[PDB]
């Protein structure tokens, strides 16, 4: 069994959600932040996949949410997996369908 380790939470107990899941676009940054105010503890990895190569920017703002962005250089269907304290959650890896956006001058 085990002597007693205290830890609530678990990946299933994590949601993510933000305006920029939804969808995404080519050479502009989507952010997005994760509710975490259900898990009590636990480790975050951002993996950006797709056709091409894409930016991640972590920082730290406040101990609610950290506030994680990413640019696609090129558009396409980026899945980006996140797995909480090592675990794969119910929601992930996202499928973020990023588009090239064409505006008229």
Avoid: M
Avoid at 5 to 17: D, I, M, P, T, Y
Avoid at 84 to 95: A, G, Q, R, V, W
């Amino acid at each position: 069994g085990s002597s007693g380790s205290s830890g609530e939470g678990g990946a299933h107990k994590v949601r993510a959600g933000g305006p920029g899941l939804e969808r995404g676009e080519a050479g502009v940054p989507a952010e997005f932040s994760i509710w975490t105010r259900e898990a009590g503890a636990g480790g975050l990895s951002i993996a950006v996949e797709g056709p091409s190569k894409a930016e991640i920017t972590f920082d730290d703002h406040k101990n609610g949410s950290c506030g994680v962005s990413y640019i696609a250089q090129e558009p396409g269907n980026y899945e980006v997996s996140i797995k909480f304290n090592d675990e794969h959650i119910p929601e992930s890896p996202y499928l973020v369908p990023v588009i090239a956006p064409s505006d008229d001058a």
